[PDB]
Each structure stands twice: as structure tokens, then as C-alpha cells.
Design a protein around this ligand. Sequence first.
Ligand SMILES: CCCCCCCCCCCCCCCCCC(=O)OC[C@H](COP(=O)([O-])OCC[N+](C)(C)C)OC(=O)CCCCCCCCCCCCCCCCC
Ligand SMILES: CCCCCCCCCCCCCCCCCC(=O)OC[C@H](COP(=O)(O)OCCN)OC(=O)CCCCCCCCCCCCCCCCC
Lengths: 115, 318, 114, 172, 98, 105, 345, 70, 83, 96
Amino acid sequence: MNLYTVIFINILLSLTLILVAFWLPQMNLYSEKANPYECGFDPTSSARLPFSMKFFLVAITFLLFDLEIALLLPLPWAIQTIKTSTMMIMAFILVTILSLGLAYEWTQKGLEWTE
Amino acid sequence: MFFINILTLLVPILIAMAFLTLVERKILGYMQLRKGPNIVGPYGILQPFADAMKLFMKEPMRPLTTSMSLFIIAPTLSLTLALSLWVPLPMPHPLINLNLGILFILATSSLSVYSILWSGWASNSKYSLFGALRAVAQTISYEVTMAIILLSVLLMNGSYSLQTLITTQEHMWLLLPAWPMAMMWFISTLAETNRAPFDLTEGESELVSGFNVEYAAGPFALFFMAEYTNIILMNALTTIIFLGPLYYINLPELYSTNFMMEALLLSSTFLWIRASYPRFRYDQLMHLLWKNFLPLTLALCMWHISLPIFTAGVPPYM
Amino acid sequence: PGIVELPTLEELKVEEVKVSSAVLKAAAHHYGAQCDKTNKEFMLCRWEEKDPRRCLKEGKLVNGCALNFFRQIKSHCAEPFTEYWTCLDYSNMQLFRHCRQQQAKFDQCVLDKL
Amino acid sequence: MNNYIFVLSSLFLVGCLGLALKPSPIYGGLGLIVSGFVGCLMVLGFGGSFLGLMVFLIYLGGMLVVFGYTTAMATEEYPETWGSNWLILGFLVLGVIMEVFLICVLNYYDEVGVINLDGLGDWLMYEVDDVGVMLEGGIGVAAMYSCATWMMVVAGWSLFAGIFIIIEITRD
Amino acid sequence: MPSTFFNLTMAFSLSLLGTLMFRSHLMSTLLCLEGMVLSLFIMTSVTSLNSNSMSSMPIPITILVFAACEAAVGLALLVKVSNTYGTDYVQNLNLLQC
Amino acid sequence: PFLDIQKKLGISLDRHFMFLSAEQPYKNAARCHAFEKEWIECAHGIGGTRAKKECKIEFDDFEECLLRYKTMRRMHDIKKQREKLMKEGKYTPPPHHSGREEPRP
Amino acid sequence: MNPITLAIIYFTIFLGPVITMSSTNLMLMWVGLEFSLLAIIPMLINKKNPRSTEAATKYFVTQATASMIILLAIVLNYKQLGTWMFQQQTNGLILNMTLMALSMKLGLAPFHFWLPEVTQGIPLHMGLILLTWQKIAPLSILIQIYPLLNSTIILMLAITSIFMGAWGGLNQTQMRKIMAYSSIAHMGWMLAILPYNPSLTLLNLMIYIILTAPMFMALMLNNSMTINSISLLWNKTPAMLTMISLMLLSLGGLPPLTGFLPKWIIITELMKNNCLIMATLMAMMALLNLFFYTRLIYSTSLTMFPTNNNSKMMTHQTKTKPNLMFSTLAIMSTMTLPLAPQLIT
Amino acid sequence: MWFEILPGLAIMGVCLVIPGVSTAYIHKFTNGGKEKRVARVQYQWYLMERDRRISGVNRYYVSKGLENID
Amino acid sequence: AGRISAFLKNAWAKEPVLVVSFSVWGLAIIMPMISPYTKYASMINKATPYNYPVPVRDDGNMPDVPSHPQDPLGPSLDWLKNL
Amino acid sequence: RMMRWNQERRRLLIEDLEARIALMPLFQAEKDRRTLQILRENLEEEAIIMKDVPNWKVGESVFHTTRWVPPLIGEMYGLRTKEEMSNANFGFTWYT
Ligand SMILES: CCCCCCCCCCCCCCCCCC(=O)OC[C@H](COP(=O)([O-])OCC[N+](C)(C)C)OC(=O)CCCCCCCCCCCCCCCCC
Ligand SMILES: CCCCCCCCCCCCCCCCCC(=O)OC[C@H](COP(=O)(O)OCCN)OC(=O)CCCCCCCCCCCCCCCCC
């Protein structure tokens, strides 16, 4: 209840700040005021156009690695087990497999950016 | 009384953020052979209030191409997540005592990244799009490396709570057993907080202003407050995790004082680093965090899996 | 199906120990050493007969043994135990490691007496 | 404080409704982030925090990569939100109305079936160990390291083979 | 719990309906798949927490792992589709009828 | 399973967590452990058809424990009758159900 | 593909159905299905053409949707019964969703619309790997829950599978599409005999696999993707026309080929269970299947289509392509009818 | 000189020592001279609820010693 | 070999991060197999009493289990106390 | 230093768990006595409320077996106040 209360207090504080920031100062807006910024000239094309991504393979690898992190995260409770040999072997296997995948991608130039 | 506790946490953190802006100006000036603000107020101490009042009495921008809903939503989201990340820290007693404190920290940090991304996409500008994509790459690299670092450190600690970290560092800092991952955690906090050399989203020289290049006045103030509150936050988290302040049951004021001194030292180190170094290129940041930090982090994670097993120093559950 | 048979409030009436958790944790080890047989009988009956209604006599015996234990402590070792459970009650976890001088004095009292 | 879980479930249903209605993938990822946060809150209310925080972190990373991808290649000049089309907004409000109508129908006609408003907030936590240590939800996921090593190895091989698979697909 | 489980089942039904009713965006289809995944995770997690099945608590994490591998492969295929056509349009992915 | 490699080799890759009454971490019994144990003990060795025909009592008890449909119906009937009696005013709650009572440890 | 990734991908392709068949847990059967799908996608898209990209995309989204429905059925069963197996009293809705999702994974009508399109645009060896190996694990899952399934929905799926397979094979000229509609019809037969006797499902599956493998090998000899391409086979490999004709007639179910045996024993078991109308309709649509097989035989073997001038140079060159395992499978799929009591159990 | 930074540093130091010290004092004041009880497990929560029932004032922090035992 | 040592020195000079990572990986692999405290971790985790010790019914036939906790019989933790 | 301090922490945790074990029989006896009392007063209230409802057995079990079934939170707090029900449901989770 207390955490929910303080989250709501933060929400109310930030909403109050942005509300007073939008309703306190004098408004004077026209077309050139609200045109988008392109260092003084008109934009040649819209910014909603496709914008090429040179680290897409690294992003997919980040998805897989983040799930490897999710697998590795119950370790502070796993170290309390009776059969610590099995836990230690399984954790070693998991981290070694993750490292081998990273090494294979590094060898196959997947970490390098395209073009 | 709990609302009074909320006030006496939130308001001093905001004043410390504003005087962090002032102290950044002063420290950067004195490292740049100049003085920094000493006119506005006695020793410049009214300069942050002047800046805040000017920004909140300047009109905001509502561009025609801009998605208004996400443009409004992003800065208030950023400030709320900054204060939410501040809420569970123990000094030595947290306002909100959690079991999975660092998991809460990680989730709230990633949501702050989303605030940056939605600001950059909503402000329909090419420099904002550049800032958003650079934020994506940056958070990919530091997210994976920082997650493994924190996993190894808490494997040494034994639980996800932070009073447990105080009890762990009752006798000795974790800097001595875990100083390489302390260095990697410090660099990860720099990249998380978007401080130089890893800022790359408010790119002053490469871009114009990056993700907040279309933001003006009030929402820009909200973004700046969120960022500098995150600076004090991540340095406070670093000194709680690694440089354990002296904790005594009879008096917690010594812990609060030692925590304050170490957090101030780490924040001043952040300003010192911004003065000292030139900015990374954002592909070099990813190459660094994926080719140097990550293999060593995996090796040290395996080492900290092995270490309590062969030393019989498995930490307690509670 | 058939109706459930559970005892009445008169059968469930007992002299409860109106004793706080810090007090119980202060007296924990000596309560586990002195009143061990009755407590183990109650746990044996509970883990053999899964029905809690088959062990009310053993539960009342456990409460009686705890009451006798605390009455003996109050009779002989009141003040060191009082300051011991107070110093335990100060801590949020009631950690034993924070109060060791009071523990030592209470242990000395319950060693020279009783 | 009784209908809190039901309010969360309704918000999750609304977020999944928006995701089904398919706006521009930026707004789709936003709705999926909100749905993931709501599901994290639901798991938090029902029990252990670890599963909710885990799915929250996983979906934060996933929708980050999705946001990068939809700015890369799955974008258009005028991105489509829920309010840009009259048909999509009409389907949204019609789905909300249909949800309200269906929960009212299950409240009245079906009595105690799947939804009971009088019984709401009474059957959230069935049985809990009142006294007990080692009860939190992360301990089972930790027991995957010991009790289900087959589960551990199939998950690890899935990630390893997935690395090889994505390299070969994007090899070009 | 039963009202919550019914709402989660309806959320899965809506996400499956979105997956089965295509629009122009394959990325939106993949997002509907991920919504189905999220509904499955929440159902499994609340079932395990309600029944206190700590032995079955690794199952939702396994679901997340394999579903994230699915999403990763879907993103790679979307990369190939965009390299072929310039967009992720399922109307462009149609030339296998003959 | 379609192939019985686990039974031939004697290993248990997944056979030890197939139900609620299986192996549990730190001996934390799941809900309806006794009911599921009774159902499996009844159904073992007689086949699926005879298990469905003859262990219907054990299966129904296990299902009622797991889903608590009849418990919900009974509690709803009790509360509906109580609120009807409150509406016609010929019933008052006792103090211990209305918030003020004598607590016991 | 370097041998490291070849070993990883092929081992995971092998491991998927093996885990599915050996798994007691429904979740482990599901992750075996995930293994099979994820591992087989890169070899589908391995040629990196637009058709291969479209085929991989369609296959991915179809199998992902069907696997999500499977996971829904598994989670709903776990909610209802607390276990990880459809034991005896799981809900009929759950079982029907399981059947429907597994039929979409298998590729039988009316969920069959992707299978000729996915089979087109991929290389012949990947079509073989798909149409033989990818159906074993879903069939194993269906076989494990055979007494629980709904005979009405299964028979409807089977009869529409055989009808649509017969009509599609009648229309198509592309060899991969012809083999895909053949797969749809034979999967219809297997599903039809599934609730009554899964031993006959396994028998028909094995007969279909040992008939489909050498037909795909003979296509792989010259990369003949078309009726005309297989029609000029007399100039390229004249020694294979008889075995092509015999294998196509065995696929048609003509006695005394051993491919008549699965249809014969499935019809016999259906007659034992009194589904004469379904058996007769399935047999007539099998006659239609035999018609498009016979048209294929007319094109490739009994007549002689005109050849090209460069086929002289192809006859100048020598080949070592037909492997040792081709003739064994061709003979065992052609001349094994007298061993029918041994082939059945 | 370099000591002109010290006013802003001192303001930051006071604003950083206020939250922790105030939180500790508020916990002590609201729990009656004792630290706020941490219930990280169901056993500790059950102890807190038992103390709340035992106290008779619906406050767990009102501890009862040997004065309740004859 | 001399060339192996030269390659190792070149790797240590130019790419020391990978050398440190591989060395730490090897040390984490081989260290639990040679340490004498490795069994002690499993024994400590076994000795940690998360669950209640359910008493057994004494039929007079097992003499090894203690009748009282303060008895010489049973698994004492003197090794942990002196560890 | 971390090895030595973690071993000391393990000994302290074992001491705390032994204190819990020593206190557990009294807590179990009090808990089942309180649960039986709550079930008894709920049964008496059910007898008072539904005495006029036809074909209703007061205290009828929903299980064919006659062994003990531990009551749910909804069973033992259904007829009490909503604040007490919310305390029983979300009390430990929402106490931070
Ligand atoms: C919080 C605690 C304090 C933390 C430190 C705070 C103070 C210092 C701050 C300095 C300013 C940092 C500003 C940003 C700098 C960014 C650049 C950067 O750091 O790049 C990283 C650089 C990168 O170097 P690089 O990029 O120049 O190297 C070139 C690499 N290639 C060619 C591949 C591109 O260094 C590292 O990555 C090292 C990380 C730390 C390693 C620590 C290892 C310690 C020893 C381990 C054990 C060894 C023995 C093993 C056992 C043997 C047994 C026989
Ligand atoms: C501008 C819009 C912004 C939208 C996003 C808002 C983000 C908020 C800040 C980030 C939140 C990240 C996710 C946090 C989830 C909860 C984390 C957690 O671990 O909570 C558990 C904790 C107690 O659990 P535990 O630690 O186990 O303790 C038990 C014994 N003490 O505590 C609990 O169990 C309490 C459970 C509730 C905690 C979350 C409360 C959220 C309140 C709603 C916020 C949004 C409101 C809607 C929008 C308003 C209008 C904009």
C-alpha cells in the first residue's frame, strides 16, 4: 500500500509540474514556431521514413542474451541447495555455452556492424 | 506520518539534484580554469532556482509534426521513474523495503530508457530519431553487461535485498573482493546515466540536442531533473553496493553521513570524468561493452559461482 | 456429504501465553531445551494424525508447559530476561548477535539458578 | 482492495485488445509494455515477485528491440494509431462495451461461474503457509538448477541453437 | 482467481484473434504473438502460485525462453523480408501461389 | 510417452514433476497434495477406463479441492442469504464478524 | 554453412522430434516442437531467394500460431487438473483445441493452405525433410492421446484433408506441390485411422515415408521440379522410369504394391468400427489421388516427351548421385505386400 | 578558489543526510522507540500479526513481557 | 614450446582481456576440484534447518536417534563451529 | 574475509532457525486452535443465518472423504469484514 502511495505521489507531482509548465507561461505559437527543427532549413523528407539499423544482429543476440540473464538470475537461491555439485556443474555449463555462443558470433563477425 | 516521510525523502532529493547542477557548473569551471556561477546568490546558490523558474515560465513547444500524447507522456514518465528508483534505497533504512530491490532498480531503469525512446520518437525530428536509436544501442550494451555484473555481486551477497548488502559489508567493503566488476559497474552506471563519455543521446556536438532537441522549457526541465536525479541515484547505488558505509545498530546517523560523503565523492567523480574525457562513438561503446567487458564479466560470473562453493562461504538466505 | 465435526469454543478455551515474539525469541533456546518432550509429542501427533482436532489435549499441554516455563523465569530471573528481550526487541530482525552481553547475563542467571 | 486484481485483469484485457487491434508497432509495443507491467502487477498480487519482475524485464528488452526494428523497417510515413481510423476506434469502444456486457451477463445469468461480483476478492489467495521460511517463488526457479536439469539444458540449448540460427538466417 | 483467469483467457483469445486477422504489418503480427505469449505466462504463473507448485515454477521461465527464441527468429525473418521488398508487407509476401 | 527411453534407461528427465503431489522444493506441500495422492493411489494399476469409472470419488474430491466450485457456491449462498436478511433487517452480525472481538495468538 | 552450424542445426532438427517422442511432460513435448520449428527455419531459408524467404515466413507464422494454441491447451489442462498430461478427464474443449492446433502444425485441410506454398520455393531435400521428418512429432503427440480425441471432428478433418489433397494434386503441375497434396491426402488417412488404431497410423506413416523418400531422391537426381522436367527423364536417367512408375502406383494404392496395404488395412479397421460411408468416400478420393499419379506416370514413363539438344552433353557427362539407400527404399516400398501380416501388428 | 564549491557541496550533503536520518527517526517514532519490523518471510509476518493480536491495542510494536504472565 | 609461449606473450601484450577471461574461467573450473572446503558447502546447506525436524515415533528399536536435543547422539555441528 | 564472514553469518542463521524451530510447536498449537475457533463461530453463524433455507445442511462438507481438509482464506474469512479479508489476502505482500 505504501509503495503504491509513493508511486501515486510521484505521478501526481510530475503531472502537477508538467501541468503548471503548460498553463503558467504566456502562449504565442504560429507556424514557423512549431515547424520541426532541421538546423535552420526545411526538412527534405519526413522523419517517419525507414531508418536503417546496422546492429540488428546484435539486437537479436541481445534478446537471446537477456533470456540467458533471466536463466542465470535464480542463482542466489540456487546456491542454497543441498546438491551444490549439480548446481555448480549446471551453472558452469550454462555460462560456458553462453560464452561459446558469444565467441562464435565474434568469430563469424556478427558483432561487427553492417556497412 | 508516512506522507511526511515521502516529503522528507522527495524534497531533499530534488534540492540535492538542483545543487548537483550548481556543483557541476562550479566543478567544471574550476577544472576549466574559470569560476562558474557565483553571482546569482551568495556563491551561486540561487542559480538553480533561477534556472528552474526561467524554464517553468518559458512557453513549451508543441510542434505540428509531433505526437502530442507521447510527447507529453515521456518527461513526466522520466521524472516519476527517477523518484521511484530513489524510493527503495536504504540509508540504512529504506522508505519502501523490498525483497527484490535490484530487480526493481533494473525494471525502472529500462522503463526510463523507454521514456527517452518515446520522447525521441514523438518529437518527429531526425535528430530526435538519431537520439532514440543511439539510446537503443547504448541500453543494449550496458543492459546485458550490467545485469551480469549485478548478478555476480549479489551472488557474493546472497540475496536481492539491500539491507542484506549492508549486513554483507558490515566488516569490509565489497570493493576489495569485487573491484574489477566494481570498475565495470561504474562504467555501466556512466552509460546507464548517459554521462560523458557515454552520453550519446543528448549529443551536443554530434547531434544538436538529440532526443530532447524539440523539447523546450518545462518538459526539458523534467528531463534534466530526471537525468541528474538518476546521477545521484546511480552513485548512491554504487556506494551502497560496493563501498559499504559504517553501520551501527545504536546509531544510523553515522551510516547516513558516510553514505552521503561517499555518494558526493562518486558524483564529483562523475563530473570529473565529464571534464576529463572526450565522447565515445556509439558503435565503439557497444564494441567495448560486448568485446571487453562481457567476456570478462562472464568469466568473473563463473568465478563467483565457484568461489563460495570451494571456500564454503555460501551466503545466508536471510 | 456428511457434516464436519469440529469442537466448540469451550473445548478450544485455554490460558494463552500473552507473550510477544521478541520475548519468545529471547526465551527460545531454553524453551526448546526444557519443554522439548511435550512439544515433540504434539508435533508427532500432528504429523501422524493430520487432523488438528485430534491433538487439542497435546496443544493444551504445550501451552501449560510454556506457561510453567515463563512462570519459572518470572519467579527467578526476571530482570536480566526483561532487559534481554528489550534489547532483542529493539532490533528489526531481533538478531541475537546485537545483544550478547544481555544474553550472557541471562544465561549466567539461568545457569547458576535452575 | 478486493477488486484490485479484477481491475488489473481488465486493464490487461484492454491492452491485449489494443495490441490485437494493431496500431503502428510503436504503439503496439507501448501497449505490450503496459500489458507486461500489468501482468507483473497481477503476478505480484497473486504471489511471488520474481516471475512478475522477470517477465517485466524480459518484455522491456524485447519491446526495446521491437522499437528499434519498427523504426528500422516496419514503419510508414503516417503511423497508424487507434484514433487515426474510425473503424479501429469504433472496434476499440465496441470491444470495451462488449467486455462490460459480457461481465454483466456472467454476473447475472451464470451466477457463480467464472465471474462473481459478490464473490470477487474472496478467492484470490486460497491457502498460504502462515508460518514458514523458503516459500517465495524464486526458489522453484532456483530448483531448476537442481531438480530440473533437463529443463535447464533444453533452455540453454535453445538459446545456443538460437544464436546459430539467427546468424545463419541473417547471414545473407 | 476464476474471474482473473477468465480475463486472461479472453486476453489470449483477443491476441490470437489479432494474429489470425492480419493487417499490413508483419511486425504487428509478431507483437500479437508476443501478447499471446504474455497471456500464457501470466496464466501459468498465477496457476503455479495458486496451487503452490514450486516444482512447476520453472515452466513459465522455460515458456519465456522458447518464446523469445521464436521472437528472435521472427525478427530475423522480418529482416530478410525487408531486405527483399523494402517493407514488411504480407501483401508483398504473396508470390508463392504459382 | 510415445517412446519409453526414460523408462528403459531408468532415468527421470521429466517424470518427477508431473503433478502437484510430486517432489517439491524444501518439502513445501502443494495444494491438494493429499487429494492428488489418493487419486493416483486409486488409479494406479487398473488402467484409464477403470480409473475413470471407479476412482470417480477420489477424482471428484481432488477436483473440488483444486477448483473449489462447490465451496464458492456454498459461500455465495451463505453471503446472499445474509445480505437478504440484512435487507429485511431480521438479522444482525455478531461482534466478532463485525470487527470488534477478543483476539487470540 | 560451415560444418559447425551444420552440425548444430541438423542435431537440433533431429533432437526436436526425439525430445517430443521421449517426453512424458506436455511442456517438454511442446519445447521439442519449438526445437523442430526453430531448427528447420534456417535450412528452409538457406537458398536466400524471395520464394524461400516467403516460404520460411509463412511456415514460421503458421507453426508459431499453432504452437501457441498448443500451449494454451497445455496451460488450460494444467489449470483444470494440476498435471502436465491430458490424463482422462481433461476438457473436451482443451482436447479439440489440441487436435486443431496439431492438425494445423501437420498441414491437413482445411489448415492445409500453407503446405503446397511452403513446399514450393524450398529445395527438394528440404521438402523431403519437411514432408517426412516434421510430421512424426505431431503424430506422436496425437497418438499419445488417442482415446481422448473426438471422432467426429477427427473424421471431418480427415475427409476434408483427403478431398482437398485429391483436388490439389489433380490441379498442380509443380512436383513439390504435387508431393505436398499427396502428403495432405496421406495425413488425412492417418488421422482417419488415428482414434481407432494408432498402430495403423504408424504403419501408414512408415509406408508414406518409405514411399516419399525415394520419390524425392529421384527428383533430386536432376532437380526436376516440373512435369516436363520429369518427363524428359528418359534421356537423362532411363533406368529409373520403372521404379518411378512402381513408386507412383504404390502411392496410388494399387495392388499388388505395398502402398495398397495402408489404405486396405485402414479401410478394414473402419469397417470393423462401422464407418462405411467415411471409408467409401475416402476410397473414392484416393482413386482421384491415383488419377493424378497416373497422369504423372503417363508424362514421365509410358510416353516419351521431346528432349533437348544439350541433353546429349548431359549424357556425355557421368553422374554418381543416386545413393545406396535409394534402391532399398524403392524395393521396400514396391514389393512388400506379401509381408503384410509382418508389416501389421 | 577551489573552496567556493564547498557551499554547494554542503547543501548537497545536508540534503543527502536528511532522507536517511529522517526515515530512521520516523520509523522509530511510528514504531515506539524501536526499528520498523521487517517481514521478509511469512514466519516474520506471522510473528508481527501475533504481536498485533497479543498487544490488545492492534499495534504490533506494543510488546508484552512477563507482566502478562502470572 | 617456444612458439606457444611467444603466442601467449603476444596475446598477453595485445589482448589481455581475453587472457584474463580464459584464465579466470580455467581457475573457476579447476579450483573446486582441488579445494578441501568443497564438501563443507554442501554440508552447511544440508545442516541449515529450513524445515521443522519432525520427530519419529520411538518403538524401542532404533538406538541411534537422540531422545533429547541435548544428547551426545546425532549430527553435531562442531565442525561448523570450529570451521 | 568474505569466506570467514559468510561462515559466521551461516552460523547465526542456523541459530535463528533453531530459535524458530523451538518456538514452532507453540505457534502451531495456537494457529490450529485459532483456526478451529474461527471455523466454529462461522459454523454457528451459518446455523443462525440459513435456518429457514429449505434442503440446507448446516456445516455440510463439500468432500466425500471424512478426513481433515484445511480451510481456505476465503472459507475462514468470508463472513468477516472486508478490511480483515484484505489483510488476510494482501497483508504480507503489501507490507513493505
Ligand atoms: C566504483 C568503484 C571504482 C570504479 C572506478 C572509478 C575510478 C576510475 C574511473 C576512470 C575513468 C573511466 C572513464 C571511462 C573509460 C572508458 C574506457 C574504458 O574503461 O575502456 C575499458 C578498457 C578497454 O581497453 P581497450 O579498448 O583500450 O583495449 C583494446 C581492446 N580491443 C583491441 C579488443 C579493442 O579496459 C577494459 O576493458 C578492462 C576492464 C577492467 C579489467 C580489470 C581486470 C583486473 C584483473 C583481473 C584478474 C587478473 C589475474 C587473473 C588470475 C591470474 C592467476 C595467475
Ligand atoms: C505516467 C504513467 C506511468 C506508468 C508507469 C508507472 C511506473 C511506476 C514505477 C516503476 C514500477 C516498476 C514495477 C514495480 C512492480 C512492483 C515491484 C515489487 O517488487 O513490488 C513488491 C512490493 C512488496 O513485495 P516484496 O518485496 O515481496 O515484499 C513482501 C514483504 N515485504 O510491493 C508490492 O507488492 C506493491 C504492489 C504495487 C506496486 C506498484 C504500484 C503501481 C501503481 C500504479 C502506477 C500507475 C498508475 C496508472 C496511471 C496513472 C495516470 C498516468
